[PDB]
Structures are given as structure tokens and as C-alpha cells.
Design a protein around this nucleic acid. Structure first.
Lengths: 117, 167, 260, 134
RNA sequence: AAACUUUCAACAACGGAUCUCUUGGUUCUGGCAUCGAUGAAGAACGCAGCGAAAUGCGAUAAGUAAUGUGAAUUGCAGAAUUCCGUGAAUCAUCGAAUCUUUGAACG
RNA sequence: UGAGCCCGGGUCGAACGGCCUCUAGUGCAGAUCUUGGUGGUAGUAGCAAAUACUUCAAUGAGAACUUGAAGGACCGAAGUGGGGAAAGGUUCCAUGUGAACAGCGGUUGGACAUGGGUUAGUCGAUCCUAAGCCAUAGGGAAGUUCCGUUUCAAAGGGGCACU
RNA sequence: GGUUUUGCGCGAGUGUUUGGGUGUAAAACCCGCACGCGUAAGGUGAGAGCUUCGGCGCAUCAUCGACC
RNA sequence: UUGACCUCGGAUCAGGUAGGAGGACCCGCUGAACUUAAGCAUAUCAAUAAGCGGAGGAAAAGAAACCAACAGGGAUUGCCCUAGUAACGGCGAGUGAAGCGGCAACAGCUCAAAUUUGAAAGCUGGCUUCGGCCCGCGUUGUAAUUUGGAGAGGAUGCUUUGGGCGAGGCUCCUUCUGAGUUCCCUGGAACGGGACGCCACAGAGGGUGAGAGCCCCGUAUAGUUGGAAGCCAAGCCUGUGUAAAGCUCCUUCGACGAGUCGAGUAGUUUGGGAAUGCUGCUCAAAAUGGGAGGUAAAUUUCUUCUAAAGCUAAAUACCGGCCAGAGACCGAUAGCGCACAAGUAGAGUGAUCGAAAGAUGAAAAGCACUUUGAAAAGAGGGUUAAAUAGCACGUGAAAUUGUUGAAAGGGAAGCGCUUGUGACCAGACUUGCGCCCGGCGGAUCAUCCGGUGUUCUCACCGGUGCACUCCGCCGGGCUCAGGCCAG
């Protein structure tokens, strides 16, 4: 299966350990700037679409406005205290709403919020 | 290649570029993290000492053994087991251990001043002219045209008078 | 380089001329004009099968076989005869699995190189240290041109516990030639069986020995292998009462008299 | 063992830098040790050579010949000690190039700059001596 | 017998193999983002006490100013540096200047 | 047995080998093979026409082919003459040298090295237009750019006036 | 990229090395979730090897079977 | 007559801007053939090479007219598998995705559609005393407000706040920081050998007259001296205007992109005639609208988005630019054409083509002087460790050549077996062992005792054993074994 000019498009990954160090240093840089804050953002629990994977859950893009209000977190403050917000996802079932609301209350219990100035 | 050969042939000095970096790799300043951060440890190692969490996502591999920075209902409504239409918006009404975490909890709970806003000199005069003419009748003040030209409600005038201490 | 031997304009002269049918440089004003090119037999020509960076430089090895080898290397390090067979001066040291007290190596007790050198002399790892020192000499070949000037023998390997000994002994042993230091939780077969030869002299700490059970109890998908033989002493098996009682009578001797 | 990433262990680069060094760099490479009397007087081990100094040759064919430095020929990494010369065919005397690493300074040419040089080296040596001592 | 032809050996030639060396190449990795009408890249002509090229510079021309270092440059010749000093240097750094004819090239 | 291995003697001056594993741009008599060098042929073929050369002296280490003089020949104004255009670039002159070039020699040379030499109001260029080409107005073309040259271009000059 | 044979590991499982975490830093050590390939009981005669000499009978073949 | 407005012009008008280079990676346009397979043709190479236009440190893409049919996901980008699967092809040669899922990185927004209408609240200039003034643009619309998982307006009650200095800090350069030149031998020169030391968070590398941790530059860690520009920042001055902002509620409203979708047709393209996408031409829309998908389920029910306006870091690419670090790479016919005054010398009208060529010696100490020669040079003499290193310069093979030495030669030489002659050589041998006497010189003779070590019965040390025993030498005799060729 080499009917094209494959030799001019061949990528060798000799920088695999070099890029890993670069990625690890970039993660350290984020911790340097956001010193007490985590380097990530809290993300919700979602169910995989297909019937092949619907028995398993994973992480979504951001929290729905309805489940953010049920937790007791204002919309405009959520991206500021380290919570991802997704305005495209709908709940459609109490099961998804309850799981992510409980996730938010667990996040609020562990939070240390400093005065503004 | 020809440029590189030319430079090696030339008498001009080689401009040795110092290893400057766009983003710093260590915290700096006079805060708790900067004074406790160890440059020779890793991100997770430093956060584990602090007693904090570094990654809120899912663990993508095996960690070190000591790592601790990587994580009646009549109406039958599931939210009833989660409670303790307007909420606070600029703050959260939030309710053995490492030194850094304990120090951080003290800074977050330290009482601070508020810098209460005052009213302008002319705003006091407008309020004072109201209380001079109508006394304590907020309804009469709202209906006045010369002394209340912006047609503000009685509730708003009452609130401003309380802030001024004019009842 | 991909363009080596290719950045020239050459063409074969033809068949009817009494010259070899090889591409020849055109022109006419240089020594290069009319000279052969593009061939692996030709001066300043392309080499045969030019070396390419996609050559499979790295080897994939099962993690099970990697851990098997490390276990065998550790076991051979406890065998005194194999230490001598690998060139280690083990004659003044007792208890071949040499375990030193962690109290004598934890903290600043060893971070000074003079202190680390003194400890090695006291325990019995001395004669293996100047064996490395006296063995240094110049490499034979072009490795000198390429950054490998000298070579010498290997010395004792210090295995410690980073969470008990304190990681500060590494700097004490760093300068001493031949002496290599390796944490217990990450053991290297390149350091345990140098050159593929088993029987490296290792000096342990007391904390490292305790951790050695824990590290092999934590490897997932790996248990300590079971050997295919239970007793390795053949003389005991053959000369046992059980075997000898059921054997036949001998049919001859080691040397047989020739009849005719 | 080298640790800092900016340091290089290449033979090719080290020989290139040494033989293509500028004059200011060559002055440091052309240093010579100080005599024992000068060491206990200034708390200084070595110093770059210069024209006014008096040196004693301790290596080479000139066993223990003493004399004052006459020239610092930085272009070929040699110094010219007085009366250390060889005759050509014609009988005219030419100096013999001696490397600074083969000599020891016995008397030091003193000026405000070199008192500043000796003071800075002494300050570092005494700083770590007390740092190591206590 | 000599001469000539051939074989071997020693020495000497022709020629530049072999060993040794390498301020070169080749490949991989890492940090960084910077040409030009405020005239670029390229071309040309000039400039050193003694220079053809390479290199550097532009009629302030193998260079000027400033900063640092601290006593050279060197093939020769001639000046230095008072060294207890704004100060040698074909020195390094470099924020200020000079910058001929053209070339996108623009009376 | 063999591919080979080891030692002695000479030369030389700065690194190298045995053992066992790993690795490969790893083993030559050929390919009218590649590059470089060297033979026999061989001191052989050969060193052409332009009738033609000779005597003394000088220079010089060295003179058939360098000079002076004399002789014998020749071009015969459609020249073997004296000047230019184009082209070349220092070949022009003096002094010095004789490594290489002038298919013999050389003291000679358009060779080599060191110095010197080209002086204009009137001689040419510089000004003018010729056949012809280019820009601008416009119009094509994905575009590098093509057509277009007076075109349905506001395109160039000059004067007068009691202010 | 297929395929045959030999050695090695684990074996109804096997494969750490996309990636993440340590590191004495391109090595070595470790592994959370998916993912690739594979997997979720008879009669008679011979027959290696055992035998308490009565017999028991591997693998495999032949035949009668049983099931899907 | 004068004066506005519109449109179009002039100016070496005041201030600006573009062109060219580079092009490794990136965004588009345009665009082959050799080759492979098959009766042929389509196909393949390839949506590649060549050609043209346009950017950056990245570019491009990008916050659903999406994926899906789910218990749902939720901008873009990239890796892994999906997968050589679906799909298209004489179902030839072949071509060939994507959803889900694991992961790296994550970030959201700006307009047009509204009347500020109780106040163009907006902005370009150029004159300044830097206080501020005028000229204009603009109502054919510049500010504030809003951008459809929204929003506005009122009402209500909580909550929130803006500017200027700024110690100091991080990053990067920069000064300084360990230890033998101790004794002896070889050597021109120790950096070699032997002895005695020292330092080491430094035994990386290089130089110095031969292998240097301690002679020198550097190397390691913590500091320390001065400077540069960005960013952060403890604190300190102030703030203000009935100024802005988040939400809550509702007997009031809620504007969403056209020669664009779409139909027909031609070319091209894709795995993709529900045309996969794009382009040209003809016609040319809608508002409980439009697009895509699911579904035999009884009608086209249901699901999911909102096109024709725009911005945006990161994970990703990189043969180019400024550097930096490395290699089981090559070692001067190798490695780039170029380790050298190499894209040079040279060739061609031109486009273009394009080499050869490294090494005296630690130090020129590069041979003074004498002599022969016209000179080039030669010979003495000299430097050097070496001239068996004299710039035709480290070492200096073979082909080919000279001299000397030996030998052979009636129309080939060379090769195999076996003697002989001549020259030249490696071995072997030189004596060992054991007995019997004699002269000795010395107590590690047997035994016993104590201690110790072991294989627990064998040894070793110390004592006793001070001589028909034991150990070495010397002088004799004898035995045996010894090299080569033979009878």
C-alpha cells in the first residue's frame, strides 16, 4: 500500500520524551501562575451516547444552567471560581440533574474562597 | 546553509541567546504558596504537602503511593436529599492538617473592611430639601414634581433617606 | 542526507561508445566533467541503500520479562561466587548481601564525599573502589573523537530507600568513580547485570531491605516466578538413597580395556 | 559531572573556543599560579599573567630559571621571560615561548586594578571558608 | 665472460595507500520569534604604513562615540603606559553616530 | 587442512589488543566497473609551405634563430606600407629575471617582477530626429502580466488689466 | 503488511511505553481508563506409559454415536 | 447677483500606507506525464510535481442551519485505536472515510436587525502657555444598551465598585568562591612508573613539550557584586457622580443576515446522485419559517439545529531565522559540491554546469659561516630527540624505475611431484632424579604439653625435645632417565 510517494510524508516520533517534558513543564507553568488554584476546571458527569457505551459515564464539557442554579452557584461567578459551564447541554432526566448537583455541593464543601481584594 | 557558512567565516561575534522563557516555572511573591514552594519537587509533590488538590479531572495513569493531589418524599423529587429564587452572586455563603492549608484557611477567614459608599454632596441636598418640605411622607415626596424631578418611587426615596440617616 | 550524490546533472553517453554505461557529468571545463556519478561504485556517488531515520532503533520488551530479568539479577547478586566471576573484589567484606545500617547513611552523614568514601572503606567495599580508580585508561578507536574518551570498571551499587534515607546520600557517592546509586523502588537491569553479565556487588541499607518485599508485592500482573526445578544440586539428587537403590548394576567403567 | 544544560562537554566545541578566543578571554587562560609566600599574604591562588611580573619557571628545559616577564604574546599563548633566550643560526637571540602554566609568580606588578583583582578573589575565598567552617 | 631479458634481496626513486589526528559534515532534541521606502536581500567601487584574496568597514572607510575589563598589538617598522590610570587592546559588550553608486529603487 | 594467528629483525612515533555478548555502510580479479597513479609501444612516428642565407665585432656563463656593420635575396603603392572602426585591456616605455610558455635554443618576447606613461572651449561623446520600442488614458487576464500609443483623458502654452 | 520454524514470558488470557506519574532526565521504574487479537461431553479396536499381574489406559486414527 | 447641497477634479498640499526579499512549515488558485492494471476506455500515479498569488511564529479552523437515535453528546485542533470497516469501483488494478470511545489542550465572544430623542451623549485633525481652543466627519447614524439555550422595560430588595504611586519579588546577563607542581627513575619535555598526601554537591570537557581531579581555564552547590526590560505585588495617597453592575418578579414587549437557499443543466471532485463539495449559466423563494436526520408502522406524526455578517489563545506543523545541547553516525575517493581565499578556479551566448585541494617540528630553533658552481643547487659545518622531519616537509604500501649483490637463458615464460648443489636459518643439547660414604653449616627430627583454626580429626603457633634424628651446601662412588643418525 505504497502506491503514492510515502517517503516524503513519514513522521518519526523521536521527540516523544521531549514533548512529554515540555507538556509537564507547561503544567508546572500553570500552577506557577494559579498558585493555590487547581490547574484544571471542574467538569460534570455525563453518559456516553451510543447503546454500546451507555452503561458507562465520563466527563462532560461544562455544567448546565439548571443544575448550576439548583446547587446554589450563580452563572456569572461559576467560570470565575473554577467551574466549567455548558449552555448547549440539556438535562432531560432527573438522574443527570441529581448527579451533577451533588457533584457541585461536594465541590462547595471542599472550596476555600478568598476575599476579592 | 550559505548563511550559516557565511557566519562561520565572518569576524562578527555570535549572538548567544540567553535561555529566556515565556512562562515562569515557579511561584513567586510574598504569599503562602511562594514561601512554601520547593523548586526541586513536582507539581503533585508540592500540592500534596499543601493539602490541596491539583487536578479536578480523572486520573490518567498510576500515581505515587503518597500522592494526594490527583482526585418523607411525597412529591418524589430527587432534589429533596440535597438541600440544607434569588441567590448571592458575588460571593459564596460557604460554611492533623498541613501548615500551608491551615495558613490558607486563616487568610480566607480574616475579617476585612468594606469601604462603605457615601452619597454625593448634591444628593444629600436633594434629600434634605425633600425632608424639609414633606417631613416623613414618602408618598408625598414621590408625587412632588419640583423636588422629585426624576419621578422616583417612594420605596427608592425611603431607601436613600435611610442611608443618609434622615429617616 | 537524502540529497547526497543526487545534486548533480549526469547522463549516460550511450551504448556504441567504448566506455562503461554509467551516468557522466556534463560540462567540459572542470575535472568533474565526463566523470561517473549516481552509482555506489562511483567516487562522490550515492551510497547503496542510504541509511534512513526510520530504522526501529528501540525495542519493545514485555514488562513480565523485564521484571523476571531484574529478579534474576537480584538473586545472582546474593551469590558470592558470581560476584567474583564478574570481577568484583569481594574478599574483605562479610555477608555478600551487604546491608549497612540506615543510621550511618541517612542525612548529612554521607552527603560529604569524604564521609561516603570512609564508609565504603569500613564496610569492606574498599578494594572494589580503587579497582575502578586504577583501571581508567583511554578507549581504543574513534569513540575518542565522538565523546567517549575513557572507560573503567564498575564499582559497588548503593541501593537506598528515598523516603527513609533521604535522597541526600546520592550527592556523597556521586563523585567516586565506579560507585553508582539507585533507589530501591526503581531498580535498573542495566545497572544490575552490566554487559549482560550477572553478579553485581550491591551494598544495601537496612531500610531498603524492608522495602524490597513491598515493592515486589505491589507490581501488578507479576508474581515471583516458580522455577521448573526444586533442587538445583544434582549431586544430591543422583547420589540420593532413593535413586541409587533402584538403579541397575554398572555395565562398565569410565575407561574400557580394548580387546583386540 | 556537568549538570547545567548550558555547559557542553564536546571536544570539538572546546577546542574551537580555546583556539578562537578573543584577546580578553585569552588573558584569563594565560593565568599563572602565585608563589607560596604570596598565597599566605593575599589568600589568592592564581592570577592572570601580565608584563611587569617576575616569574620562576618550574616546567620545561629551563629548570629553575628566574626572570621578569617581557611580553605576553596572547596570539600563541606564550610569555617571554627575560634572559630565557636561544640563539638563531646568525647568533641573534630570540625569546623562548614559555606557557604560564609552567611558571610561578614570585613578585607581582602592583597597581590599583590588580589590588582590586586580588581583593575580589580573597573575598570569595574567605566567604566560603567561613561558610564551610560554620 | 660481458651486454641484454627475467627472479629475489638491500638501498634510492615514482606515487600517495595504510595507521594516527580533526576549529568539518550529517542526524536527533530543546528554548525563542527578529528583514524591507527610517530604503531590505543582491550587485559594484573605494578604505590598512607596508595587502592580492578571504574578512571588516564606507570619504568619520581593517573604522567613530558609549560601557566593561584592565596593560597590550605583533610579520616588520613607528608610536605607547608613567602603572598608582577616564586607560593599551586586530579586546569584549553595545542603547549613540557616519553610512559612496545601484538594487522593490523613486527628478 | 584452510581462511588465518603468533613471534624475530628494520622503520616509526601515540595510541591499541585478548575474552564473551551487542551492532553493521563488514570480506573482490573480473562489472568495455569509479577515482588516482604508473607501464610496453619508444628516445620510435614525428618537429610541414611561405626560394636564402653568409662574414667580422659587441653583450653574455652559454649565441644558427640578440645586437651593430657589410654582403646576397624579397614585399613592389590592388605592399611583407603608414592609419583608423569593431574587439581586446595595459599587451605601450624603462630596468631586472630566466621557474614555467613561445612542440630546437635564447642573453630575445604580447612571458615573469618592479616603476612610469594617456594633459582639449575648437578632435569624438555630450544636442536632434530616423526605421522602430516603452510609459501614461483606458480595456482584458486567476495571476505572473497582455493589448492599447491618441484613445468619447478636466492632459499644453501665452497675454491683458490704474485694485 | 502477511507467513513458517526455533528460543523466552504469561497463559483463557495477553499487550506498560497514545497518554499520565517519578527520575541521578531521550535511559530506568510505575499504571487509571479504553482499545487490538483470542476465549466465554459416550460405545468399540488399536495405541505411549503404569500394574497390586487381575487389569488401568495419554495423544492420535478407524467405526457407531450424541448435540448445535 | 449671491449662497448652500451633490458629484467630480488639482496641488512637490498635512500626515500615512503598499510594492521587494524569505517561502522549512501555512492559506488559496492552477495543474501534468512517466509508471501500475485491465480486450479497449474509465481508473492509478494524484486532487501530487512544475507554475501563480497571500501570511505568521505558528498559520488555518473554531464557538453547531453539528453528532446522534442515546439513560445521550455539546466550538476548534492533534495522537491512539475505529480501520483497511462503511461506501464507490469489470464490487479489476484498486480507492477508501466518519460517529462513538481513551487521551493532550481548553475560553469565550462582537455586530446588523430598536428612537438617546428630556438634549451626537461619538470621533479624525492642528494651535497651544499642555490648562485648553477652534477645523471638520457624521443624523443616508458616530456613542451607551441587546445578540435567540437570549434580551428589553418597569417594580422590588439585597449584593458589587473606580484611578495614581509603589518597597520588594520572579526571569536573564555579570564579579568571586577546593585540592601536590613533595621525593626518586626513564625521557628533549612527565601529563608515564614507584612512594608519600590532599580536595571532592566539583573524577564533564579542554590546554599545558607524552595518559593531569589537586599547573591553568572551566566543572558542583549555595550564596554574593552590578545591570537590563517585562510582569507580579505588601502597602500608601485618593475617590462621588442621586455614577455604574448582578439577580428576582411580571395584568407590557421580544426586532435574528436574499441573486441567498432551492429547481434545471455543464465541468470538476469525493468513499459518498438523499448530487460528497465547489464553480458557471437559466429560472428564482419562505415566515407556527428554514436545514439535516430518524421512521412500513398509516402519515409523511418524531428528533435535532438555526445558513447566507465577524473576532478569538492552547494542545498541532516546521529541511527556513537567533541560539543551545547531544550521537553504538562519517573520518579527507568518506562526511554536504565545499574540513582549505568553494558555489571559488574553470566551461557555456545564455539558462545553467561545476571541481581539485588538510597533517614539518613541543618550539622556526626554517640551516649562521666556509667552499664549488653563471645560477639553480651541491658539499662541509650547524639547529633539533630525530633532517631516516629541510616547507616537493607526520607515517610513506603497490604498480613502475636506477644502482649494487646472487643466479638462469639453443624458437616463450610461469605451475605439480622428487632428489641434488649453493646461500641462509628455527629447534634440540649444555644435565636432572635417586641411593651409599665423608667434611660441614644450622634446630621448623619423632614425642609430649598449652593456645588457636578447622573438614571434629586433621593442622598451625609457643615450649620441651640442645644431636645414630631433621634441613641446605660441598667432595667422591653408583643407578636410572636424558638429543641426532645408525648397526
Amino acid at each position: 500500500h505504497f502506491r503514492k510517494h510515502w517517503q516524503r510524508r513519514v513522521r518519526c516520533h523521536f521527540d516523544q520524551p521531549g514533548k512529554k517534558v515540555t507538556r509537564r513543564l507547561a503544567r508546572r507553568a500553570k500552577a506557577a501562575a494559579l498558585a493555590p488554584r487547581p490547574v484544571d476546571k471542574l467538569r460534570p458527569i455525563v453518559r456516553c451516547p451510543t447503546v454500546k457505551y451507555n452503561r458507562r459515564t465520563r466527563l462532560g464539557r461544562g455544567f448546565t444552567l439548571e443544575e448550576l442554579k439548583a446547587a446554589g452557584i450563580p452563572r456569572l461567578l461559576a467560570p470565575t471560581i473554577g467551574i466549567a459551564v455548558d449552555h448547549r447541554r440539556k438535562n432531560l432526566s432527573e438522574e443527570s440533574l441529581a448527579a451533577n448537583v451533588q457533584r457541585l455541593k461536594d465541590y462547595k464543601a471542599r472550596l476555600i474562597l478568598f476575599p476579592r481584594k | 546553509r550559505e548563511l550559516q557558512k557565511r557566519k562561520r567565516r565572518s569576524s562578527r561575534p555570535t549572538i548567544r541567546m540567553p535561555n529566556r522563557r515565556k512562562k515562569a516555572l515557579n511561584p513567586a511573591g510574598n504569599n503562602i504558596i511562594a514561601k512554601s514552594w520547593n523548586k526541586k519537587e513536582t507539581l503533585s509533590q508540592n500540592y500534596t504537602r499543601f493539602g490541596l488538590v491539583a487536578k479536578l479531572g480523572k486520573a490518567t495513569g498510576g500515581t505515587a503511593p503518597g500522592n494526594k493531589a490527583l482526585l418523607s418524599e411525597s412529591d418524589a423529587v430527587p432534589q429533596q436529599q440535597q438541600q440544607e429564587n434569588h441567590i448571592r452572586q458575588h460571593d459564596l455563603e460557604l460554611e492533623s492538617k498541613p501548615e500551608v492549608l491551615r495558613a490558607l484557611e486563616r487568610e480566607a477567614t480574616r475579617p476585612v473592611e468594606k469601604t462603605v459608599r457615601h452619597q454625593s454632596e448634591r444628593e444629600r441636598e436633594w434629600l434634605q430639601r425633600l425632608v424639609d418640605k414633606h417631613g416623613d411622607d414618602v408618598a408625598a415626596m414621590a408625587r412632588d414634581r419640583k423636588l422629585n424631578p426624576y419621578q422616583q418611587t417612594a420605596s427608592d426615596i425611603k431607601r436613600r433617606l435611610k442611608k443618609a440617616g434622615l429617616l | 542526507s537524502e540529497k547526497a550524490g543526487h545534486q548533480t546533472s549526469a547522463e549516460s553517453w550511450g551504448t556504441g561508445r567504448a566506455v562503461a554505461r554509467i551516468p557522466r557529468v556534463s560540462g567540459g571545463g572542470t575535472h568533474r566533467a565526463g566523470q561517473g556519478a549516481f552509482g555506489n561504485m562511483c567516487r562522490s556517488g550515492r551510497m547503496f541503500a542510504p541509511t534512513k531515520i526510520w530504522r526501529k532503533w528501540h525495542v519493545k520488551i514485555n514488562q513480565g520479562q523485564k521484571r523476571f530479568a531484574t529478579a534474576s539479577a537480584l538473586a545472582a547478586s546474593a551469590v558470592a561466587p558470581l560476584l567474583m566471576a564478574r570481577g568484583h573484589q569481594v574478599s574483605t567484606v562479610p555477608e555478600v548481601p551487604l546491608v549497612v545500617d540506615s543510621a550511618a547513611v541517612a542525612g548529612d552523614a554521607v552527603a560529604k564525599t569524604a564521609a561516603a568514601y570512609k564508609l565504603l572503606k569500613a564496610i569492606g567495599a574498599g578494594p572494589d573502589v580503587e579497582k575502578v580508580k586504577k583501571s581508567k585508561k583511554l578507549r581504543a578507536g574513534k569513540g575518542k573523537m565522538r565523546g567517549r574518551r575513557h572507560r573503567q570498571r564498575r564499582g559497588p551499587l548503593i541501593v537506598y530507600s528515598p523516603e527513609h534515607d533521604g535522597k541526600e546520600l546520592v550527592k556523597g557517592f556521586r563523585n567516586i568513580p565506579g560507585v553508582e546509586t539507585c533507589p530501591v523502588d526503581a531498580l535498573n537491569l542495566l545497572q544490575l547485570a552490566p554487559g549482560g553479565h550477572l553478579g553485581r556487588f550491591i551494598v544495601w541499607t537496612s531500610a531498603a531491605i524492608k522495602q524490597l518485599d513491598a515493592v515486589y508485592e505491589s507490581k501488578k500482573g507479576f508474581f515471583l516466578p516458580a522455577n521448573i526445578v526444586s533442587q538445583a544440586d544434582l549431586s544430591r539428587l543422583i547420589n540420593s538413597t532413593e535413586i541409587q537403590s533402584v538403579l541397575r548394576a554398572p555395565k562398565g567403567e569410565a575407561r574400557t580395556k580394548r580387546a583386540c | 559531572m556537568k549538570v547545567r544544560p548550558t555547559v557542553s562537554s564536546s571536544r570539538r566545541k572546546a577546542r574551537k573556543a580555546h583556539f578562537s578566543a578573543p584577546s580578553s578571554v585569552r588573558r584569563v587562560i594565560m593565568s599563572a599560579p602565585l608563589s607560596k609566600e604570596l598565597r599566605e599574604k593575599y589568600n589568592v591562588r592564581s592570577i592572570p599573567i601580565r608584563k611587569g611580573d617576575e616569574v620562576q619557571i618550574v616546567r620545561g628545559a629551563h629548570k629553575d630559571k628566574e626572570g621578569k616577564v617581557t611580553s605576553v604574546y596572547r596570539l600563541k599563548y606564550v610569555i617571554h621571560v627575560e634572559r630565557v633566550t636561544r640563539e638563531k643560526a646568525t647568533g641573534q637571540t630570540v625569546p623562548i615561548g614559555i606557557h604560564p602554566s609552567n611558571v610561578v609568580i614570585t613578585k607581582l606588578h602592583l597597581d590599583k586594578d590588580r589590588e582590586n583583582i586580588l581583593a575580589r578573589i580573597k573575598a570569595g575565598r574567605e566567604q566560603v571558608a567561613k561558610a564551610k567552617g560554620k
